[PDB]
Symmetry: C2
Subunit: 258 residues, 2 copies
């Protein structure tokens, strides 16, 4: 009866409230996805419990062990009824889970430290003085592993074999490494996170270029779940009433410290 | 065995080839959607026949007669197996047909004649000297009919009752009326068309402002069609290989005459 909503700690989507550690259940969290889960549950009329995924990963299938980890895995093996998160709608995932139409548009972007002499993906691919990496084990990393485009083929070639590891267990680790690297590390991350950080102190980073691709986040359910339909109509409705567009403004630009 | 693909005459999506009238079948057409239909059929492995919808409408349900017209209607009553077109993924439609994940992102934008003193939706709503309208009987018109947002409520109020009719049987009629109106008519149309025109002679129009909303075009099939799944995976695949992104460039920016 109570729906398990799997989710991940990623700002500004799901974040601990100023005084969690002092609260319980869904009270402990806040963010875009928290508000979104709340809206969806209201229109779908369910009680739900937010659960932060254990391994803190998004979802990939190990090639040797064939097992799905992360949020996707929680759905695939039934431990979660629905994931509300910045979960990218990719082809491999859609074969094993279900996705609503996107609730947010985005694309892979480049985040530099202010004053870095990089404007584009080519600017980065045609040099070695500035290191650059991506979040680990996610759709951004995969974008490059798979690309058949010259420049992205160049980039994946550099990153795939870079010492130390240019990937990062987390978004914050990439951001941190951009801030601490005196303009000698560009981070490749999804435009939405990039845009969020750009409005946070010490306001020393910035989005350069246009996006490398296009894609969306979907609310995801297990393949064949009875919840799939209501959930999709719910997201579309929130879209049509401007809600998503009201929620984006709130967590990105009103929280803006610059 | 041969799949009927319903479609509409809308540039640059589906357009007559320089010397149709002299050709037959799918040969008569070209455009983004023609290339897209072709790609999809290749991965789904079907022979198909392109059909331009009779009434030249997108799809709405008459309130008195309860009947669906346009491309949607062709799917709903089985005369078409799949629509490949600039068909907006809206809530009311998704209740009766099926939609792939979006193959293109867009939003309602404002198209002025160069030099018009309008930058935004508020700029337009706070005056009466410049008329402004929308395509008729489509999701853009509906966006305003439904909006609960002050400024859009103002705008729909003006348009709903404007003499002569500010709506337009067609995109081209709106564009034409913008070009012939000496900066006394702004056209409200989807960003993608707006962007296309902006790069066409006599290059006397331009997109002003940001978009009023967000949404996508989906490839649509009848509700429950066995084709729904293959089609969705196909669109996602084309996305991941950069195809859609190769096709956008081709019909928008390489055809560019400015
Ligand atoms: N949403 C992603 C995960 N994810 C998040 C990021 F912020 C990012 O830069 N890259 C990435 O893959 C996908 O679902 O794996
Ligand atoms: N794609 C639309 C139709 N459509 C097209 C336009 F170019 C436009 O400006 N407005 C609109 O509603 C929907 O599916 O009705
Ligand atoms: Zn804490
Ligand atoms: Zn002709």
């Amino acid at each position: 009866r109570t729906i398990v909503v799997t989710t991940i700690l990623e700002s500004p989507y799901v974040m601990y409230k100023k005084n969690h550690e002092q609260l319980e259940g869904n009270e402990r969290y806040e963010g875009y996805c928290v508000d979104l889960a709340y809206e969806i549950a209201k229109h779908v009329r369910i009680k739900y419990k937010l659960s932060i995924v254990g391994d803190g990963k998004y979802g990939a299938r190990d090639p040797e062990t064939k097992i799905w980890n992360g949020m996707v895995g929680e759905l695939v093996y039934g431990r979660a009824d629905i994931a509300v998160a910045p979960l990218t709608i990719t082809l491999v995932r859609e074969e094993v889970i279900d996705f609503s139409k996107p609730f947010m548009s985005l694309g892979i972007s480049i985040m530099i430290k202010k004053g870095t002499p990089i404007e584009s993906a080519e600017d980065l691919a045609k040099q070695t003085e500035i290191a650059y990496g991506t979040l680990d084990s996610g759709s951004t990393k995969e974008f490059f592993r798979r690309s058949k485009i010259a420049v992205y083929e160049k980039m994946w070639s550099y990153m795939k074999s870079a010492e130390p590891s240019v990937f990062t267990k987390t978004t914050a680790d990439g951001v941190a490494r951009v801030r601490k690297s005196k303009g000698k590390f560009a981070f490749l991350l999804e435009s939405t996170m990039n845009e969020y950080i750009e409005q946070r102190k010490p306001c020393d980073t910035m989005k350069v270029g246009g996006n490398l691709d296009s894609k969306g986040y979907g609310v995801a359910t297990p393949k064949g779940s009875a919840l799939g339909t209501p959930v999709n109509l719910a997201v579309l409705k929130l879209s049509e009433q401007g809600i998503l567009d009201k929620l984006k403004n709130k967590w990105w630009y009103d929280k803006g410290e610059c």
